[PDB]
């Protein structure tokens, strides 16, 4: 694995989110996604292996605790 991922936060899923239209996801509890963007409102842009979505920051955890940045 030598090529260097580009650089996203990977955010842990809590709950299951239930889809609702083409663009919303259908992540599952614990499953792990990729954080592309984000809005004020609070809804995130992640994108799994499968599809890409938005979904509420609510059903997303940080799962790095605190490392040392620089």
Known sequence: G??????LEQYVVVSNYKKQ?????S??????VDVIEKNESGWWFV????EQGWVPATYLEAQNSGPSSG
């Open 21 to 25: 239209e083409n663009s919303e996801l």
């Open 27 to 32: 992540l599952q509890a614990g499953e792990v």
């Open 2 to 7: 030598s090529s260097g991922s580009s650089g």
């Open 47 to 50: 994108s799994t292996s499968e």
